[PDB]
Design a binder for this molecule. Structure first.
Ligand code: HEM
Ligand code: HEM
Ligand code: HEM
Ligand code: HEM
Ligand SMILES: [Mg+2]
Ligand SMILES: [Mg+2]
Ligand SMILES: [O]
Ligand SMILES: [O]
Lengths: 305, 306, 306, 305, 306, 306
C-alpha cells in the first residue's frame, strides 16, 4: 500500500487549506479525491526535479462518516479541546485538509487553485495559510525548527499506520494548530531566558544538557518515552506565516503520527502540565486559534473511488 | 555624484508592497526611519548575500512631502489623478509612504518589513500590504509572460531616473501603484486566440502580434506611446501576482517607475479613457483597479541626510 | 537483484541516440566494447559529478543477438513489426545496436559517443545519429509537456524490468525506437483548443481533458490500455526533440521501454491501425515515423561478463 | 549614443551559427526581419531568465550591405580575403547574413533560430548551420582550455567596438568566422608534451609556456601581435566544438570579433602564410578551414531602424 | 538494516579527519560523547539543509575498543599491521578514535569538529588533524581523477557493511587511514605518458589503459584483486588532497572502508610487498605514508545506546 | 582608472593569505613573477568560470619596494607601526610581499598559491600562510556577522583606490593585515547581551545598537571616524576565520584596504591606545594580534609593465 507524500523533502513554501463540506457536497468531494494525485502531477511535472510539489489530503472524523461507509480508521475522532488552568487548546471546524508543499509558492498556489476550482460550490473555506521558511530553518521565535524530527526508517515507523489497523495501513494522522505569537513579550526576554523556554541554544541549536534544561521547557515536555522505554516520535513541518500590517506573527503547526495518542499525549503535557511543570512555557508566548485532526489515507484508498 | 535607490533591480521572485499613511504627530518618527532604512536593508540582507538580492525602494507621496520636508518639491509630484472613463475607473486611494521590498525569497522581504514597521508603529497606519510571488516562467495571473518589453541597461537608466530637468532631485524616480483584481472565470471562458487579441502577443511563445493583426484596443497597442519627437516613451514595470484561493482573489500588483509621471499618466489615460479608434484597453474588462497612488522615490543620499 | 542498466534515469536535458549495424567480421570487436561500456560511462562521467548525470543504455537487436551470443534468447526479442495501416505506416529499419546516451549537457553525451564509436570503427555502419534537446519546461516539438504520466519509483521498476517470467534475463528491458518528423506548418494552423483535442491534455496547464470530453482518437485515449489484470499497462518514455532549421526538419525521437514488447506493440497497433471507435491516433496526422527498431537492453552484469 | 549588440556575452555553453545568402528579391523580407530580431530575442529569451542567457548577434557581409542599404558603408567592411599559403589555405565561402545565437541551453538557441528562419523562408538560402557545445571545463575539441586570454571589461570594449574612428557605425564590430575540421587521429598520436608545443600552453593547467621554451610556430606565438606602439592587438573569440560521431566530423567553429578586421586578418596571415621564424601555425597541421566569411555586426539601434 | 553511519555519503568537497588518543581516565567522557555524536551532527547540520550535507563517521580502534566496551569485539578488529617491504614501509601510528567529518563546505566540518573536541577537552590527545578539499574535477594532488571505480548503490552496500557474518555488528564497517605526502618535484619530472604508466589510467580522459599496455606494477593493476569467489573485491575510498604551500607539503589522505579489513590489507600487501611480477606499487615511488591506523565504525544504533 | 587589481572582489567563501620575505639574490625572480601573476590568475581561474571567482591581489612592503624598484615611492608607504598601548599591543612582523588569494572554493586558491610559490622557490622565505573559510551566514569566529557596513559601489572605489592625490600610483591601494587569535572560552562566558555591548550590534539580527545605548568602548564606536567634512572615513574589510581544533586555535585574519593608510592607522590607534572616553576597544580583550604588516597593492598596469 503506497502512502501519500507524508515524508517529504525539506520544502521552503506551503499552503495549508482547511475546508468544510457543504450539504450536498459529498459527491463533488469524492470525485476530487480520486483526481488529486493526477492534478499534483499535472501542475508539478513541468517543474521537476527542483519543484518538489506534493499535496497531502486529510479527512476529518465527521466528514469521514458522511463520505464513506463501513469500517473507519481506529483512531479517528474530532480534535479534543484541552481546558488547562491557564492555556486552552480550542477545536475548530475542518472536514478536509490540503497540505500543499513545494520549493516555490507558485506551484503551491497553482495546485490549490485547481483543487478549489473543482470544489467551488461544494465546500466553504475555513482557513488558508501561506507559509514560508525563514532563513536557516528558523521559526518566528528565532529558533531552528525541525532538528529532532525522525528521519528515514524511524520516520516511516513513527508516522505510517501498520499491522495495528491493517485495513488502513499506509495512512497517517495529522494534527493542525495555528498559533499566534506575542512577539513583544518574547523579545523582552534575554536570549538565555528564551533558551530556557525552548530547551536548546538559540544560535547553535545545541540541546541544553539534562542538568540545566528546565522541566517546563518545550523540549522537556514534548519528549515522551513509551512503556518499553523507546522514544515516541512525531513528524512535524511547522511553517511561519504572518502579516506585518496586522502585527500577526505565527507558526502553523502540523504533526503527523501513526496514532493520535502520541500527538495527544504531547499536547496534554503542554497544556495541562505534569507533576513537575504547570504547562509548556512556549504557550506563555503562543496562542492556538485553530485545532483539527485529520486522517490522511494511503494513496491507493483515494485512487479507488 | 548621486546614488539612486535600487529602482533597477535584477529579477526577484518575491516582493512585499507596503503602503501606509502618516498619522498626525508621526512626522519625526518617520524622518528618523527614512535616514536609517538603507542601514536596515544591509542589516537584514548582508548575511544572505549574494543570492538574497534584498532591496527596499522608499517612496513619498505629494501631501506627505509637504508635511515632512520644506524647500523644493520634485517638479512632477502630485496626488494620483482619478480617471473616470465611460466604463472603467482608476480610483485614487490614500498613501503617504511606499515600501517596495524585493528579494529572491519572501523571508528576507518579511524580515525587513518587520523591522521598518517596528520603528514606525504608533506613527503610521497600514493601508495596503501585498505579498507577491513570481508565477512560473515570468507569467502573470492571466497566463501571459509579464515584463518582456521592459527597458534594460542604459535605456532603463534614461527612462526612469530624474536628471538635468530637475537637478536638485536627480537620481529619483516616480512610482505609480495600482492593485488589480482579475475576473478569472470570465477570462478562462475566452479562447486562447481571443486572449491574445486582448493582450497583443502570443500566449505560449510571447511573440508580439504583427501590425497586420494587432487590435487597436489591445493592451500592447494602447500602452505603446511615441512622444512628440518620434522616440518611444518607456516605463519600468515590476508587476507581481498575488492572491488567495479561498477568497477567490487573483491579482496583479502593478508598479511602474518613470522619470516623469506624465509618461505613466498618458498610458493610463489611453487605457481608461480611450483613443479615437479604441474605447478602452480590453484588459480592463477582466481587471479592476482597487487602489491607486503616486510616489516620488528620492535618491539614496537624499534619505541618508536627515 | 542483478544490477539493471540506467533505464530509469533522472530527468536529463540532452541525449544522443546512436543506431548501428554490425559489419561482417565485427562481432569480436563489438563483444569487447560491450564488456567495457560501463567503465567508459564512468570514465567520461565521474569527473563531472554530480550535475552531469551521464548514462548509456546499450541495446541489442534480434538478429544481432544470435550473431553475438549463444544460449538462451530473451523471451520477447524479435524484429520490429511493420504496421501497414489504412492511412499511416510504422516502418522497420535496420539496427543491430542501440546506444541511448543521456546527460544534463550535450558535450558529455558526445564525449561518451566518441569513445564508443572509437572502439567500433571498422566493425559497424552507422544507421542513425540524433542529438536531442529538451525544451526548457519539459515541452516537445508540438509545444506540449511530454513525460507527465510516465510511471515512477516502484511502479516504474514493475513496468520496465524483466523479472521472474524470464529469469535468466531479469533486470533487462525492451526498447522500441522510432524517429518522427513533424509537419509544423500544419500543426501551427490549428487552434490551441484543436491541438488539445489531438493530444488529450490542456496545452498551458497540462491537465488531462476529462473522460466526457476527450476524443477517442486523441493520443492519450489510444495509448491508455488496460490489461487482463484490470490495472493499466504502462511504458517508460523519454522522447526528445531534435531538428535542423536550415533543412526544415522538426522531430520527436520516441523511445519507449517496457518489461515485454507486447505492451509497446499494442499501443502501436492502436495508434496505427485504429480501434472500433477510432480510425487512428490523430497525432499521426502531424507526425511521420521514418525509422523503427526494437532492442533488448540486458542487465548491466550480463554485459560486464564477456 | 549607441547600444551595441550582445557581442560581449557571458560564458555560454551552447550556440547556433547560421549563415545564409539572400536570394534575388529577398531584400525587403530581410530588412523587415532585421528590424525585429531584437524583439524576437526578447520574446524567446525573457521567460527563461535568468539562467537562459539567450542572445543573438546579427551580421551583414560586404556584398549584401550594398544590396540592403545605401549611404555610408562601414570603413572596414570587405569580402573575406582567401589566403593561399605554401602549405595551408584559408578559403572564402559565400555568406550574406550571420546569426550568432548563444545561450546556456541548445533549445533556446533552436527556438530563436526557428523564429528567425520562419520569417525568412522563401527569401534566403542556408549556407551553413552548426550546433555548438562547450565541453564542461571550457575545453575544445583538441582538449585545451579555449578562451583564457580573451580580453574582458573595458579592454574588451576597446578591442571589439567601433568608436570615433568611424563614428557613423560606433557600437558595431567585425566578425570573422571559419569552420575548422580536425584530424583527431593524427592529434591523438602526439604526446601531451608535443601538443603543448603546438598550442603554446600546458594542457592540464593551462599555464602559458615560458618565452624561452615556447616554439615560434606555436599557435599562441603566432596569434600574439603587437601594434606600432608595442601594445598587444586583441580580439574576442568564442570558439565552439561541434561534430558528428557517425560521420567522424570533429570540428571547431572559430568566431572572432574585433573593432577592425585588420587585426584578425593579420593574425590569419601569420598563421597561414608564416613569418621569418615560422613556416605556418602548427595547429593547421591538424585543422582544415572549410568556410571563411567576414561580417559587420551593427549597433543594435542601427537595426531598430 | 540496523541504521549504519553515513559511510556512503554523497560527494562532498570538504573534510576534516581528526585522530585522537584516549588519555587514561578519559573513558567515561568518551562514552558520553559517543552517545551524543549523532545529535551534535544534527544540531550543527540541520540548519544548513539541504546543501550542507554534513556527516560524521566515528571509528574506534582495537585497543580503545577493549578499554571502552563490555561485550564482544567485532570479528575483524585488530591494530593496523606494519608492512616492512624491501623498499617501502607502511607505518602504524597511534589512534583510538577517528572522526571523519564531511560536508559541502569546510565551515560546517569545523563547527562540528569544534563541538566534538569541546566535549572531549581534557580526556583525549590530538594525534592528527587534516583539512581536506576536493579539486574542482575530482582530481588528486598527482593530477589524476580519484574515485572513478568506487562501487555504487547496492554494490557499495555489499562491499562496505558488515552483514550476517558478524550479526551483533551488522551495519558497521572497517576504515583504514593513511596520510600520504607526495614528492611533487619528482612526479612532475615524469612525462604524462610515464605518469599514466604509474597509475594505469589516462590522465586527461580517465580511461583505463588497455590490458595489453597496463603495467603490472601500476597502481590500478596492484589494487585490482579477485577473491577466492571468481569476482572482484572492492573497497570504498574517499581520498582527499591536503597541504601547505609554504611548507611544500602536498598530500593525499587515504581512507578506505570495507566490510572486513582482509580486503584492504590484501591491497596494501600487494602495494608494499609486491607480487610475482611487480616489486611494489609504483605510486609509492612518489608517495610516503606517515600515518596508518585501522578503526571499526559501528552502526548508528550501537552508539545511540551507551 | 588605470585598471586596479581585484581589490573590490565579490563575496568569496575561501581565501589563502601568503606573506613572504625576499631572500638576498631573490629580487629578479620576484620581479619576473610580478609581471606574470595576472596571467597565472587567469590560467588557474578561467576553466572554473563563472562559479570560481578566483582573484589574487599582490602587495609590496616599504623595505621591499626600495629593493625592487627605483623611481617614485607611493606617498603613503611605510613599515607597519607598532602600537604599545597601556594594556594591548599591535606588533609589527616582517613581510615583503602579500598574496591575498580569494575564490569560491579553497582548491582554486591552493592551485594559484602553488603556482606562485613554485616560481618563487629559493628566492623567498614564507612567514605566514593562512587558509580562511567563511561561516555560512557571513559570521566570524565570535559568532557575529562580519562585513555589513563595508562600502559598496562608487563609495567603495572612493574609499580604497589611490587617485589624483598621488597620480603616479592611481589605481593602487594600501592593505593592512593582522592575524588575531581569540580567547573563545572567555568570550563564550559572556551573555549574548554582553557580547553585543562589545561589538556594538545585535548578534542574531545584525542591527546596530542605537546611539543612546552603544558603549564608547565598543568596536563599532571606536572604528567609526569622521573626516574634516563630517563624512565617515571608510575602509574595505574582508576578514576571514581560520583555525585548528586540535591546537585550540580560533582566529580572525584581518585585512583592510584604504586609499591612504592614515585612515586604517587612526582606527588602530583608537582601538589599541584608547581615547579620552574609551580605554581601548573591548574586542581586544578577547583577541590577540600576532602579526602586523602594511603593503601597497599597485594598479595591475604597474605590474604588467616590468
Ligand atoms: C507553538 C508553536 C511551536 C513552536 C514555535 C515550536 C518550536 C519548536 C522548536 C524550536 C523545537 C526545537 C527544535 C526541533 O527539534 O524541532 C521544537 C521541538 C519539538 N516540538 Fe515544538 N513547537 C511548537 C508547537 C509544538 C506542538 C503543538 C507540539 C506537539 C504536539 C510540538 C512538538 C515538538 C516535538 C515532539 C519536538 C522535538 C522534541 C525532542 O527533542 O525530542 N511542538 N519545537
Ligand atoms: C509522435 C511523437 C510523440 C509525441 C510528440 C508524443 C507526445 C505525448 C504527449 C504530449 C503525451 C501526454 C503527456 C505525457 O503523459 O507524456 C504523451 C503521452 C503518452 N504517449 Fe506519446 N507521443 C509520441 C509518440 C508515442 C508513441 C509512438 C507511443 C507508444 C508507442 C506513445 C505513448 C504514450 C503514452 C503511453 C502516453 C501516456 C498515456 C496515459 O496517459 O496513461 N507516444 N505522448
Ligand atoms: C597515495 C595514495 C593514493 C593515491 C594518490 C591514489 C590514487 C588513485 C587513483 C588516481 C585511482 C584511479 C581512479 C580511481 O578508480 O579512483 C585509484 C584507484 C584505486 N586505488 Fe588508489 N590511490 C592511493 C592509495 C590507495 C591505497 C593505499 C589503496 C588501498 C589500500 C588504494 C586503492 C585503490 C583502489 C581499489 C582503486 C581502484 C582500482 C580498480 O578496480 O580500478 N589506493 N587510486
Ligand atoms: C579581531 C579582529 C576583528 C573582528 C573579529 C572584527 C569584527 C567586526 C564586526 C563583527 C563588525 C560589525 C559588522 C561590520 O560592519 O563588519 C566590525 C565592524 C568594523 N570593523 Fe572590525 N573586527 C576586527 C578587527 C578590526 C580592525 C583591526 C579594524 C580596523 C583597523 C576593524 C574595522 C572595522 C570597521 C571600520 C567597522 C565598521 C564601522 C562602521 O560600522 O560604520 N575591525 N568588525
Ligand atoms: Mg504586540
Ligand atoms: Mg581590562
Ligand atoms: O514543534
Ligand atoms: O572588521
Amino acid at each position: 500500500p503506497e502512502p501519500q507524500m507524508v515524508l517529504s523533502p525539506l520544502t521552503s513554501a506551503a499552503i495549508f487549506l482547511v475546508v468544510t463540506i457543504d450539504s450536498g457536497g459529498e459527491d463533488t468531494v469524492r470525485d476530487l479525491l480520486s483526481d488529486v494525485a493526477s492534478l499534483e502531477r499535472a501542475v508539478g511535472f513541468r517543474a521537476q526535479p527542483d519543484g518538489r510539489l506534493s499535496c497531502v489530503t486529510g479527512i476529518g472524523s465527521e466528514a469521514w462518516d458522511r463520505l464513506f461507509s463501513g469500517a473507519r480508521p481506529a483512531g479517528l475522532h474530532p480534535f479534543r479541546e484541552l481546558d488547562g488552568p491557564v492555556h486552552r487548546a480550542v477545536a475548530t471546524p475542518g472536514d478536509l485538509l490540503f497540505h500543499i508543499r513545494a520549493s516555490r509558492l507558485d506551484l503551491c498556489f497553482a495546485l490549490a487553485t485547481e483543487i478549489m476550482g473543482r470544489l467551488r460550490g461544494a465546500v466553504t473555506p475555513q482557513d488558508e495559510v501561506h507559509g514560508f521558511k525563514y532563513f536557516d530553518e528558523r521559526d518566528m521565535l528565532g529558533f531552528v525548527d525541525g532538528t529532532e524530527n525522525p528521519t528515514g526508517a524511524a520516520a516511516r515507523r513513527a508516522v505510517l499506520v501498520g499491522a495495528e489497523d491493517p485495513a488502513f495501513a499506509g495512512g497517517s494522522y495529522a494534527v493542525v494548530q495555528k498559533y499566534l505569537h506575542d512577539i513583544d513579550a518574547w523579545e523582552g526576554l534575554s536570549v538565555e531566558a528564551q533558551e530556557r523556554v525552548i530547551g536548546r541554544r538559540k544560535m547553535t541549536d545545541v540541546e541544553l544538557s539534562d542538568d540545566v534544561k528546565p522541566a517546563d521547557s518545550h523540549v522537556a515536555l514534548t519528549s515522551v518515552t513509551g512503556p518499553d522505554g523507546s522514544d515516541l516520535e512525531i513528524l512535524r513541518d511547522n511553517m511561519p506565516f504572518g502579516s506585518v500590517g496586522r502585527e500577526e506573527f505565527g507558526t502553523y503547526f502540523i504533526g503527523y503520527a501513526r496514532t493520535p495518542e502520541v500527538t495527544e499525549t504531547m499536547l496534554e503535557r503542554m497544556f495541562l502540565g505534569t507533576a513537575s511543570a504547570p504547562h509548556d512555557r512556549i504557550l506563555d508566548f503562543s496562542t492556538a486559534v485553530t485545532g483539527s485532526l485529520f486522517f490522511t489515507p494511503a494513496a491507493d484508498f483515494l485512487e479507488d473511488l
